[PDB]
Every structure is written in structure tokens, then in C-alpha cells.
Symmetry: C5
Subunit: 151 residues, 5 copies
Amino acid sequence: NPYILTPDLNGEGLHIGIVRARFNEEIGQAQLQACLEELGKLGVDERDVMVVSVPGALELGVALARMAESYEFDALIALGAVIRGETYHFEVVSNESAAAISRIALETGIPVANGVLTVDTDEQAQARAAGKGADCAQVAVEMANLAAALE
Amino acid sequence: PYILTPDLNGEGLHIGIVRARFNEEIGQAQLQACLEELGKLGVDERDVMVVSVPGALELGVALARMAESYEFDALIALGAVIRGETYHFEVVSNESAAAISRIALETGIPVANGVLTVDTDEQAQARAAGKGADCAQVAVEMANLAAALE
Amino acid sequence: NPYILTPDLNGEGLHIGIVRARFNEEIGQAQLQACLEELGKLGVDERDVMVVSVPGALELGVALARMAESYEFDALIALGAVIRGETYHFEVVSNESAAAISRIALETGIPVANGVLTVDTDEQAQARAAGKGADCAQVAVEMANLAAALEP
Amino acid sequence: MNPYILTPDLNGEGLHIGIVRARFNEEIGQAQLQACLEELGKLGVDERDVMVVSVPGALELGVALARMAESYEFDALIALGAVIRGETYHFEVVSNESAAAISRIALETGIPVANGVLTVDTDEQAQARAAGKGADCAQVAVEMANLAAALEP
Amino acid sequence: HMNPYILTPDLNGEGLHIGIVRARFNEEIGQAQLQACLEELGKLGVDERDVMVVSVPGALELGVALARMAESYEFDALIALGAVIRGETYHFEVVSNESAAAISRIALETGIPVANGVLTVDTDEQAQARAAGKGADCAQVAVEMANLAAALEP
Ligand SMILES: [Cl-]
Ligand SMILES: [Cl-]
Ligand SMILES: [Cl-]
Ligand SMILES: [Cl-]
Ligand SMILES: [Cl-]
Ligand SMILES: [Cl-]
């Protein structure tokens, strides 16, 4: 019987930062609403959440990095959609955006929820946008509280 | 040629566990097999900590904070990445493994990679218990191997 | 209604650095013309923009890095085209050039627009050159302003 | 042109070599190591200057080589083992990460690390390459250890 | 319109110090590259007394050599030569990826341009067709980029 930390989905008093990659506009918009309502449903106050926008997923890294450095946020959320087109640009954007999100969380200690879809079709992104947005709100809240522990 | 001999001895070691809950049943089977093997090696139930994160992408931040505290001789990563419909499988598989590798290299804390990267739920089920036990065997040996080399 | 920062596409007073990988020259030149024209439309002064060129995408990293380190530029732009040929060289050039662009922006804090095409055919590069050049101007301007809001 | 051309130096005399062996695929690793030590001695390395360690798998090579490199007790390091494709993407994960760690350690500490980890599709391919790969890693470690010493001061 | 400052390429090797590392595996290919590379370097004005040439067994060993040479800051630019030719195993992908990543990483961290002259092809026949051209190209890249770094050092 080992000491088992229980997940804490209690947004009360957490400061959450959100960055939305706008490309595939309709997809990003659906994610954000599902994310914000779940944040409020989880206990996050509208006054403790900031939302910013970037043209595309490759620009997420520089934005999320600056917010992590401010240390004003307990956790961050990355939103957006990369939809396969005709070229190897899909694999590049998918790899680099995911790696940057991963790297920021590791070096600054600020959890970053990876809500960036990497899909083949608009239909796949539409089916996942709202659900993944809600999941990203849950991941940010739990991982922010998990970060406060272990400190 | 001096040949360091393997040392499989939990014996009072503090081992940290992070479990990605996605594909929950798989993670629980790994954790059950993992703790059982840890005790079989001599790790005290009060000296091993277990933490949970939603998915494999959240392992990096959890394992990282635990490693920096230097409270643990070795770490264990558990969870399962099962191929679905999208390139998300390759992303989660690559980044989760890269973080586990990176935390071990930079911090000196060995991290057993118990994250399955499989194509089907059936493959994860066939391997869950075996890989959980192996991560206990790797975590114990690598914690001890660090001491002979520190 | 959470505080929602709105995009700022106002180039006025911004200093932009541009690095153009010349291999597949016609594509790089089309991107540069579309990029500069869009920069001016956003309010960037022609006297505040520097343009340098390198033989290929693998040489972008070292040039962009020195420009970022000088901290003379609010944002940087990488232009060029990697077109699949006969060998794994395509995957190597595409991966490493993109990875360096990401790493420079992450570590120095200066946004770098990734305008390097990674395509299979010359026709694909031609169809995308002008749009990607102009898009890189919009990304550089917007992200330079976005960085300023978080700098203090 | 007649530029100065540094010539390879394959004179192990007095070199201290560290070895880390991934035990998974047992027969492959020892066949590599026996071939490796035999070639090291043929190159002039004394048996008293070589240390040998074992790890469960290739993914644990990185942390072990890292502790040895940080000590700066070794002129060059060698990583041995075999990754044989099975049924899952695990083959690519182990192959990529283990090689990347070997690469990163050599760059950051300046201590060359010979990459002796095979990445093959079948046991038969691993067997065909095991013996040659042990010897090749000895020639790489000795030569690259001396090349670091030249470029040193 | 927009007529910004356009720094123009400088292909004048005169007074540049170039370091070269040649991965010997596939000997004939690497040597064909080196001769084409030295011949082009001299054509650009680089003195044979300002060029150093070193050797490594393979591309996986390029990184550690190039890194030590770059740290000395005795060289205005570096060149990596060699060939990785696909065989029977995933070793081709590993060697191609890691050697290229190290070459890229050294240029970023030290500021010393490193020309990637490592071919990554499927057949010896492709390597033969490219050896001389890439050797000459790495001479032009090293010279031009050495001068471009100097223009940005101020
Ligand atoms: Cl950072
Ligand atoms: Cl807009
Ligand atoms: Cl940098
Ligand atoms: Cl290190
Ligand atoms: Cl030219
Ligand atoms: Cl370095």
C-alpha cells in the first residue's frame, strides 16, 4: 500500500494561460469554448484565465514559452489543429509543435496541456475539437495542482 | 577487465511511479505487476510513491519535478499508447519516450520506460503485466548501478 | 468572458530580419517579394528590414541564430524551399531546418516565421511561394507584437 | 592543394576504455563484447584499463554512459547491444532514443562514444553483424580517443 | 514599395581558415568529395596552409570531432564529408538522422557554420553521381557562410 496522490480537479484559485493556433479557424473556436466552460465548471474564475491567439501551431512555442517564464500561471493550455494536406509540412508542424509544448513544460515546470490535434481530415478534427478542449481543461487543472505538490 | 556485477536489491530504496491513466485498465495491470515485483526485490511499501497523470504527454512534467527533488533513487513511467486513427500515436510515442530519456540523462535519475507503444488493445493486454514487472527490475538495478558509479 | 488578448497586426516601428535560402531560387525570390510587400502593407518601414541569403535550408540555422543573438530584430523570417528529390536528404533537410527555426525562437525569445516549404514537386512550391511569403510577414508582425505584451 | 592531413592514430597504449552493455538479446551482446575486447587488446589497450557494465536494455544505456562520462575517468566509451524489430513501434523508440543519447553524450562531454547498438529486423541479421560490430567499436573508441587528445590543447 | 538592405553573398575565401572532417566509411566516396572540395576551396582563394583535414571512421563519429574543432575557434567554417548508404537495416535512418542533427547543432551552439556534405542515399551509384558536386558545394557553403558570420559578428 504505497502513498497515492489523488487527482485534484479543483480550479479554485488557479491561474491558467491559453494559446490558440487559429489556422483551421472553426476547429480552434470549438475547442476554446469547450475548454473555458470546463474550466469554469472545474472552478476556475474568468478573472484568472488569459486567452491569446497565434497564426498557427509552429508559433505556439514562442508564445507559450514567454507565459511560462512570467510564472504568473500554474499551468498552460495549447489549442489548435494540424490537418494533413499535400506535403511533408504536416509531419514537420506536428513534430515541432508537439516537441516545443513538451520542452516548455519540462524546463519551466509549468504543465502544458497538448490540445493540438494532428489529424488527416477536417472531419476528424471536428469530431475531436470539443472533446479535446474539455480534456485540456481537465489536464491543466489536475497538472497545475499536481505541480503545486511535489514543489 | 573490471566487470561490475548486477545488483537486484530494492532494500530500502525510494522508487517513484507515474502512471498515465489513459487506457486505464492497462495502466492498473502494469502498476499491480510493478509493485508486486518491487516488493519481491525488497522495496518497502512506505518508501515508494505513486502519482497519476491523464496521459503519456503529462509524464514528462511529473517525472521531472520528482527527479529534481532527488528524493528517489530511481523512477518508473507507466502507461500505454495505442495506435488509433491519427498521427497522434507517433507524437505521443516519440515525445513521451524522449522526455523519459532526457530526465534520466540530465538529472542522473534512471527512469524505467514502462510506456507501451502498440497498435492494438490486445497487444497492450498481452504485455501489461510483463512490462510492469520489468520496470521494477530495471528501476531497482539502475538505482543501484548509479551508486556504484556516483 | 476571460481576458482575451486580440491580435495586433501593426508593423509600425518593427525591425524584421529575413533569411532566404537560395536553393530553388525562383521560389525563394517569389516568397521574398510577397513577404516584403505584405510587410509594408502592415506598416513596417523598408529601412528597418534586413535581408540576408544562404545557399540552402541547412544554413538557415546559423544565420538566423546570429541575427537573433544581436537582439537587433523584433522578429525573424526564414524563407526557402525544400523539394523532394531521390534520396532521404529531403527528410533530413526538412527536419533539421524546421527544428533549428523552432529552437532559435524558443531559446532567444525572438519569433521566427517558418517560411521554408517542404514539398514533393516544383509545382507545389510555385503554388505556395507567394502565399507563404505574405503569410510569413503577417506571422512576423503579429508575433513580434505578441512578444512585447509578455516581455514586461 | 596540400593541406595538413591529420593521420589516424590506432595506438591504444595507455588508454582507459569504458563499456556499457545492453543485456537484452543476450547472445548478441556478449558475442559483441568478446569480439570487442579481443580487438582492444590487439590495439594495445591493457585489460586493467577497461571497465565493463551491464544494463537491462538499450534505453538504460544513456544514464549509465552519462555517469561514466561525467567522471572524466575514461578516454572513450563504447555502447553495445542489439535492438531487433518485433511487433510494435517500440523498435523505433528504442533505436531512436538510444542512438540520440549516445550522440548527445559524446557532444556534450567531449568523450567519444562508439555506437555499437545494432538496429536490425531479425535475429539472423544481428548474428551476422555481432562479431564485426564488437571489433569495429574498439577501433572507433581507440582512434577517436586519440583524436580528442590531439585536438585537446 | 519595399527596398530593404540586401546583404549580398561574399564568395571570397582569401584569408579564411577551413576545417574539414571526412567520414571514411565508403572510402572511395569520401575521398572523391575531399578532392573536389579542396580543389574548389583553392579556386575560391583559400590557402592550403589555412586548411586542416581530419578523419573519422564514420558519420556517427563526425559530431565529436567537429565539436572539438569548433570550440577552438581556430576555424572560420567547418565541412563534414562522407556517405551514409542504405543497407539492410534501420541503421541507415539512425546514422543519417544523428549525424545531421549533430552537424546542425554544432553550427547553432558555437556560431561556426558547418557545411553538411554527408550524402544520405539508397545506393552506391547515387553516391558516386553526387560525390564531386557535394564536395565542391560544401566549399562554396563554407566560404560564403564564414564570410556571412563575420558580417554579423559586429
Ligand atoms: Cl525555454
Ligand atoms: Cl488576423
Ligand atoms: Cl541558441
Ligand atoms: Cl550530459
Ligand atoms: Cl552566389
Ligand atoms: Cl556544443
